[PDB]
Design a protein around this nucleic acid. Structure first.
Lengths: 176, 1066, 326
DNA sequence: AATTTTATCTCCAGGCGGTATGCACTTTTAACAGTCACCCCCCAACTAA
DNA sequence: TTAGTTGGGGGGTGACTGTTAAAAGTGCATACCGAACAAAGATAAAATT
């Protein structure tokens, strides 16, 4: 939002120009091709590309880098300090949410046992604007679900006792 | 919800399958990654040859192919790898090695030693795959296999019990490589078990392989020591007065005391009435101590957890050093250190150094206990005690070291000290943990009135000129609480208390003195190692004289005087007596114009408290040893002078410490003992310094009434003794003289009292002996005469004569002072001439006395100081010219040698090599950390330039100090053969009251024999051969040779007259 | 590297500034190192009783010869202002004096702090000893000792560019801010009266005039503005808490605060006093994350007063006499 | 070669701390493009760490 | 005191799969800045012009 008007995006590199001009042509030629082997064949062609194309792509890249450098030098004066603080808080929050995301993904990538379910949750799962219906079922609450919710966790209890066994072997002693 | 549970189980199953797949392709790496492509292919092929891949043939192929100063990081890594062996954590060291070998930048630090250490560690467990991995590493790095690599391979093969073909191939490979099997068994790193297993492996295929035959150690054949070690003669070595069983019991008690590492004594301060406040303070103190213990344990556990992870990520840490000792021991040491802290605080660097020196000692002692040297030491000591026991007979009388060697000396488990950066890092970490983990309530008077907690230790800055110094200071409330509680016990480190059993004989620069605790042979700074290198590089039979003399000095059995201790305690507890040497209690004290009085009054009470606490430790030890027998071991400084190890209570202190000590073994007074006792008493008084022995004896006989009264009623009588120069020793001498005289047979009374025989200006005596100048020699009692000769009086008389002549000629300042020239004015300058005084340092010494002079006008002090200094030096020139020549020659030689870029060294006539450890510290060393950046000096950096200023200043006096130490050593060695108890203080010799004649005769004989040899020419030849003999440089060498080869000529003096000198030692 | 005034017009302007307004005409003027004496004779021609504290033994004869028939006041004492009251030495040599003996000779009397300025001192600072002289004067002022025991004495002197810039540093100029700036702005009202280049003064050596152009070109090379500063002790310096028998804790606090310049004041408070640091910061009216170099000189005085004023805890400071000469 | 500057009595176990700048090397993220894969923001509810 | 399922619809960010290059971090080393307290007369060695 604020970052876009404050400054544009970085220039695309030589290998990126090569991908821009050649890969869509290669993609258009092969209809069933997917991006994995498309990008790998593009890499193969670039490794086979003559050095003249590399040189001209590098010249374009450095011209764009120079014009971006001048644009940035002009831009640093055209932003009022309030926009600077807004940018700083934006990047700080972005870093925090990215770190939270990767920590959550790390935790879930080791097969963490599920948290104990709820009796109302089990009831609404069996019974089944999603927000409207969630509010409806919540206000309505106000198959042995009560015991099964704890029973599942006791069923999951044998997992978490086992879930500590690999971590000490693998070497992640902080989790326990 | 069975479907949901089934779906969750399925997802969990695919998740664990994915984890297994990503694992089978934070563990610890075991297979190295190699830069070389063909070597990587070779390792892959060796792995792929068979699932049960035989590594022995590949090891044989790898071995048979065979195609200056370490940095701080390298030293730290090597120490880490070495400690991981004792700690018994091999996977950690292996993983760190593989990670360092992986990255391009880190692999350049590694050296063959680290590879060898890890290989040996793996071989000790009989493993082959990891050994092959490290062989791959050493081959890929481009290094070469060495003696240690082959030793590790042979040990692994022997432990695994393989067939003889591979052993035959390995041994023949060493033979073709130029490797000697017998040279293998001399490697220091290998232990006894490793050598035994290597021997078994060798014997598997070469049964007729034997170690070199043992030989009796050679005896010293030097010219001076050939008489001491001569086997033809009559020897009566003294024996102790105790049976064997008592000595063995004492040995057991001392062993227990050293294993405990702490000894607690009862405080000697005035006991306090148990009020309510005292009990409340004690309860609060106990609760605080328990809380601190628990918090420190938790903090240490967290710190170890934090430090392990750093190694788990490929960085060097201090995890094994923390894993060396038990948690309880570390916590107890930290608590003791916190308790011992003074109220005024301690420097941060000093605390960091101390906290790492105590960790090493406990580690060494526990290592000895676990390994199994304690039982061997017990057996050997209980067998060797037969030599000193009274009711035991050794087949042949021997010196203690000779007997200890002849019984079969157990091998000493030498322990490697840590490098200086590791010690400093460990100390700083421990100090930071102690600072962080300790907390106390803010308001002690009423708990929970203010619930906030405040630290116990604070980190303040102290400013001196420009420099900052970080200082840890205790909270004042804790100090006041400690003072109010009045704890009744003191705690002493086991190395600060005299031994309760005869000390271990010195048999090598590594072993001796205390039973288990380490002790430097040459006391110096922590990092310096050139002295030890020079000591170890010398032939083994050179240091026999020094070791024997140290052992003889350490075997004297002391005991505590009773009545003197009782009187001192009576004075000390009630009110004190500053005029005698007993500090006054803190209760007795004097207690913008008001600022001046407060500034001075607070200044007075500081040193008053400092002295009282210093004497509290000494007097508490003596009471604890009031019915026991104790010993004091000895060691040397870098020149050769000998000092006792226990610092608190020894005969090198003030008169209060010298009056509480006496020989445990007494001797009959004989026919000429009472006279020596009386002469010693008169000498102690100091009234008749310049009189013959006949007049001293007559004066002693004429005041027998005062002596008897002082011996009868010391504190309520005439109190005559208090006027003496040494009030306290004089009382003990009075008691002994009265007891001897009152006895029925005065010639058969047994006396336990030492008798001193000092030397007047021993440095100048040695200088005059070297220069052979008659005028100088005659003034320091090197010639027979009827009365003592005092050099100070002669110098004062000459200065007064010069002053009278100048006043007759006419001069205002000269005639200003008439009769103001005395011995007291010039005594300090004449005494300090030996230490290279100058015309500038003498001015400040003369002015100090002139200021205290009263009748002298205060407007002439500057001119009087100038005139007196000039006259004193002019008169000194006439008396001693050879001394001036010798001093100039030595100073010039030292300066010229230091300009070439080398520190001076020489050899004493006995054989001990000496070296001067003066270097310039230019680059600064720091340690960044949580609290502060500690600045330390890297001692042991042999690349620093010599300090020319401090090497031309300290050479002339150190030579003389080494000479006098040699003279003392020779005297002690020759006195031992006659059966005498000998204890010396630098240049004062102590013995029983009945052996003074023999000791004087031996002193004179050994002085003449020592100074008859050509000392100066030997020193010049050594200096010429050691330094000048260089072909690379010709001009510096030419100048140095020109200076060195010009030795000053001797005078015309006969050294034989010393044997007829009555007052050479008086 | 002593300096003296030789120009006629510069001396006339300096005398006009020194006399200033004719308010309180009979103001005694102590002259520090008159040297040649053109300044002293200019002040005498202006009509003021001047006494010269000349140091060199060779200058009194000329001063007395010019003032033999002065008929006004040219009392001369062979004394040095910066060498007044040495702290070591049983007897005081003629170049030095005693702060009490000189005033006994001058006949002036002691006066309380609250009253007016009794005397004025003019001169120039040492060439190589600006910091030493400033610290000595601060120690002699904060304890009301030496010349300051006789009242608030005004000091007017010349100073170099670098020392002046360090001395007048403010939280708006944190590069040169230090302790000396704080302890000198807390007690005096510093003013700038005149500006002059180094070329106006003729330098002097031990031998005599330094007429060498090459060394004069060094003066051109070392040409720094020689500012003129006037110092008057503040009336309200000594409160009920900042007594003359208490400044040592203040000096140590200021020294410790500048040991770690780039640190907040909260950690220094935690390492200096056992009281709740946040309470002190709230009482003096500041936030927790306040830097050391963001504190005005009066704020340090306010903080010291706030800490000293409390009575709940017996122990307030960790500074003791043992933290000296360590 | 001459002129100006500096230290001036030894040994017994002593060392300043903080902030700024520079350099040689390694590690990290942002840029492009299409799919798609799982996660995350909402109303409301309950249980564990 | 805070977060995870539960709950679908709707967005979001990155993975997968390539190469590139300009910052960001690391470990080491040197340089400059920070309180006082007299000094007269002497002399040879070390540092500088």
């Amino acid at each position: 939002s604020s970052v876009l008007a404050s400054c544009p995006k970085k220039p695309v590199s030589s290998y990126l120009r090569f991908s821009k001009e050649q890969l869509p042509i290669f993609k258009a030629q092969n209809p069933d091709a997917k991006t994995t082997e498309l990008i790998r064949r593009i890499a193969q062609r670039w490794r086979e590309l003559p050095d003249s194309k590399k040189k001209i792509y590098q010249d374009a890249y450095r011209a764009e880098w120079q014009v971006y450098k001048e644009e940035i030098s002009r831009f640093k004066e055209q932003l009022t300090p309030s926009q600077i603080m807004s940018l700083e808080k934006e990047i700080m929050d972005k870093h925090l949410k990215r770190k939270a995301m990767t920590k959550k993904k790390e935790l879930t990538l080791l097969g963490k046992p599920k948290r104990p379910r709820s009796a109302y949750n089990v009831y609404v799962a069996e019974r089944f604007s999603p927000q409207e219906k969630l509010k409806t079922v919540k206000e309505n609450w106000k198959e042995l679900y009560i015991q099964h919710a704890k029973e599942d966790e006791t069923r999951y209890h044998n997992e978490m006792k086992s879930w500590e066994e690999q971590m000490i072997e693998v070497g992640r002693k902080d989790l326990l | 919800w069975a479907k949901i549970l089934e779906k969750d189980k399925r997802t969990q199953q695919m998740r664990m399958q994915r984890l297994k797949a990503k694992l089978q392709m934070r563990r610890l790496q075991v297979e190295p990654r190699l830069l070389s492509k063909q070597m990587a292919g070779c390792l892959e092929d060796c792995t792929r040859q068979a699932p049960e891949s035989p590594w022995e043939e590949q090891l044989a192929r790898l071995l048979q192919e065979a195609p200056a100063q370490l940095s701080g990081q390298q030293q730290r890594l090597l120490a880490f790898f070495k400690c991981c062996l004792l700690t018994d954590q091999l996977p950690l060291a292996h993983h760190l090695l593989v990670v360092h070998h992986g990255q391009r930048q880190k692999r350049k630090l590694l050296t063959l030693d680290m590879y060898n250490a890890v290989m040996l560690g793996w071989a000790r467990q009989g493993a082959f795959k990891e050994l092959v991995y490290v062989l791959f590493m050493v081959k890929d790095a481009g290094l070469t296999p060495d003696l240690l690599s082959y030793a590790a391979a042979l040990q692994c093969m022997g432990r695994q019990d393989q067939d003889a073909g591979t052993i035959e191939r390995c041994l023949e490979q060493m033979s073709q490589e130029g490797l000697k099997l017998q040279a293998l068994f001399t490697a220091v790193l290998l232990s006894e078990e490793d050598r035994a297993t290597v021997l078994k492996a060798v014997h598997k295929v070469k049964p007729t392989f034997s170690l070199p035959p043992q030989l009796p150690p050679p005896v010293n054949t030097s010219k001076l020591l050939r008489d001491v070690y001569a086997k033809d003669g009559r020897v009566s070595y003294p024996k102790l007065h105790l049976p064997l069983k008592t000595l063995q019991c004492l040995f057991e008690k001392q062993l227990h005391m050293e294993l405990a590492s702490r000894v607690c004594v009862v405080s000697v301060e005035k006991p306090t009435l148990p009020s309510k406040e005292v009990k409340h303070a004690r309860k609060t103190l106990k609760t605080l101590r328990d809380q601190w213990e628990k918090a420190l344990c938790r903090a240490l556990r967290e710190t170890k957890n934090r430090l392990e992870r750093e190694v788990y990520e490929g960085r060097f840490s201090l995890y094994p050093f923390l894993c060396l000792l038990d948690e309880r021991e570390v916590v107890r040491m930290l608590l003791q250190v916190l308790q011992a802290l003074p109220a005024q605080g301690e420097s941060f660097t000093t605390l960091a150094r101390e906290l790492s020196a105590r960790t090493f000692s406990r580690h060494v002692v526990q290592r000895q206990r676990v390994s199994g040297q304690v039982q061997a030491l017990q057996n050997h000591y209980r067998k060797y005690l037969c030599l000193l026991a009274s009711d035991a007979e050794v087949p042949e009388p021997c010196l203690p070291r000779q007997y200890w060697e002849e019984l079969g000396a157990p091998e000493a488990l030498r322990e490697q000290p840590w490098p200086l950066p590791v010690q400093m890092e460990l100390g700083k970490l421990l100090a930071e943990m102690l600072v962080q983990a300790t907390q106390m309530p803010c308001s002690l008077d009423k708990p929970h009135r203010s619930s906030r907690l405040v630290p116990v230790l604070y980190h303040v800055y102290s400013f001196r000129n420009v420099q900052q110094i970080g200082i840890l200071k205790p909270h004042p409330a804790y100090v006041q609480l400690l003072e109010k509680a009045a704890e009744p016990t003191l705690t002493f480190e086991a190395v600060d208390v005299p031994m309760l059993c005869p000390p271990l004989p010195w048999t090598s620069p590594h072993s001796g003195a205390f039973l288990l605790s380490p002790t430097k042979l040459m006391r110096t700074v922590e990092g310096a190692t050139q002295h030890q290198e020079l000591l170890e590089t010398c032939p083994p039979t050179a240091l026999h004289g020094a070791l024997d003399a140290l052992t003889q000095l350490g075997n004297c059995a002391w005991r505590v005087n009773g009545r003197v201790l009782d009187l001192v305690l009576q004075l000390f507890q009630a009110k004190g007596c500053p005029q005698l040497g007993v500090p006054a209690p803190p209760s007795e004290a004097p207690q913008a114009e008001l600022r001046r009085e407060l500034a001075h009054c607070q200044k007075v009470a500081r040193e008053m408290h400092s002295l009282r606490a210093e004497a509290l430790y000494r007097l508490s030890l003596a009471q604890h040893l009031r019915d026991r027998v104790f010993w004091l071991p000895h060691n040397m400084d870098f020149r050769g002078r000998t000092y006792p190890c226990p610092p608190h209570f020894n005969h090198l202190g003030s008169d209060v410490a010298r009056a509480l000590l006496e020989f445990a073994q007494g001797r009959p007074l004989g026919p000429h003992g009472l006279d020596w006792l009386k002469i010693h008493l008169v000498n102690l008084t100091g009234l008749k310094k310049r009189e013959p022995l006949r007049k001293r004896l007559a004066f002693a006989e004429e005041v027998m009434d005062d002596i008897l009264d002082s011996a009868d009623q010391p504190l309520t009588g005439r109190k005559w003794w208090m006027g003496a120069e040494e009030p306290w020793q004089t009382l003990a001498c009075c008691m002994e003289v009265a007891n001897a005289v009152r006895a029925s047979d005065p010639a058969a009374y047994v006396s336990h009292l030492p008798v001193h025989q000092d030397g007047s200006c021993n440095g100048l005596q040695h200088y005059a002996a070297l220069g052979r100048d008659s005028v100088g020699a005659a003034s320091v009692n090197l010639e027979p005469s009827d009365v003592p000769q005092d050099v100070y009086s002669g110098v004062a008389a000459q200065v007064e004569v010069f002053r009278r002549q100048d006043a007759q000629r006419g001069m205002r300042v000269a005639q200003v002072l008439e009769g103001f020239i005395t011995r007291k004015v010039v005594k300090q300058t004449v005494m300090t001439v030996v230490y290279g005084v100058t015309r500038y340092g003498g001015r400040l010494q003369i002015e100090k006395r002139l200021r205290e002079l009263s009748d002298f006008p205060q407007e002439f002090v500057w001119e009087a100081s100038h005139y007196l200094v000039r006259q004193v030096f002019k008169s000194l020139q006439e008396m001693f010219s050879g001394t001036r020549a010798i001093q100039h020659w030595l100073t010039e030689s030292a300066r010229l040698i230091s300009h070439m870029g080398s520190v001076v060294e020489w050899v004493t006539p006995l054989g001990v090599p000496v070296i001067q450890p003066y270097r310039l510290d230019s680059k600064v060393k720091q340690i960044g950390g949580g609290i502060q950046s500690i600045t330390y000096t890297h001692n042991g950096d042999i690349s620093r330039k010599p300090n020319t200023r401090k090497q031309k200043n300290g050479f002339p006096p150190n030579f003389i100090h080494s000479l006098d130490s040699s003279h003392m050593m020779l005297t002690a060695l020759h006195c031992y053969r006659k059966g005498l108890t000998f204890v010396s203080v630098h240049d004062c010799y102590w013995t029983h009251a009945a052996d003074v004649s023999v000791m004087n005769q031996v002193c004179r004989e050994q002085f003449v024999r020592l100074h008859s040899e050509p000392i100066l020419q030997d020193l010049s030849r050594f200096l010429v051969k050691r330094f000048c003999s260089e072909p690379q440089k010709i001009l510096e060498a030419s100048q140095l040779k020109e200076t060195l080869q010009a030795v000053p000529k001797p005078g015309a003096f006969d050294l034989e007259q010393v044997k007829r000198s009555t007052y050479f030692f008086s | 590297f002593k300096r003296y005034v030789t120009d006629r017009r510069l001396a006339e302007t300096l005398a006009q500034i020194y006399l200033g307004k004719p308010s309180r005409p009979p103001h005694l003027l102590l002259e520090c190192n008159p040297g040649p004496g053109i300044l002293t004779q200019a002040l005498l021609e202006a009509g003021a009783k001047v006494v010269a504290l000349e140091s060199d033994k060779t200058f009194i004869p000329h001063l007395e010869s010019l003032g033999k028939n002065l008929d006004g006041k040219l009392r001369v004492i062979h004394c040095d202002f910066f060498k007044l009251d040495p702290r070591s030495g049983g007897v005081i040599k003629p170049p030095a004096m005693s702060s009490r003996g000189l005033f006994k000779n001058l006949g002036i009397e002691a006066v309380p702090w609250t009253a007016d300025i009794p005397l004025k001192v003019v001169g120039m600072f040492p060439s190589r000893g600006e910091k030493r002289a400033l610290w000595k004067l601060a120690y002699d002022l904060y304890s009301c000792t030496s010349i300051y025991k006789f009242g608030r004495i005004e000091v007017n002197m010349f100073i170099g560019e670098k020392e002046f810039q360090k001395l007048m540093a403010d939280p708006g100029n944190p590069d040169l801010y230090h302790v000396l700036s704080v302890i000198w702005q807390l007690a005096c009202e510093i003013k700038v009266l005149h500006m002059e280049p180094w070329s106006s003064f003729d330098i002097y050596t031990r031998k005599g005039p330094l007429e060498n152009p090459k060394r004069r070109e060094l003066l051109d090379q070392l040409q720094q503005k020689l500012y003129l500063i006037q110092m008057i002790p503040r009336q309200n310096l000594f409160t009920k808490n900042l007594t003359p028998m208490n400044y040592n804790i203040f000096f140590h606090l200021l020294k410790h605060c500048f040991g770690r310049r780039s640190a907040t004041v909260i950690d220094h408070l935690r390492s200096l006093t056992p009281l709740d640091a946040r309470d002190i910061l709230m009482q003096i009216g500041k936030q927790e994350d306040e830097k050391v170099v963001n504190m005005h000189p009066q704020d340090f005085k306010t903080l010291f007063e706030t800490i000293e004023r409390s009575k709940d805890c017996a122990y307030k400071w960790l500074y003791d006499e043992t933290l000296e000469d360590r």
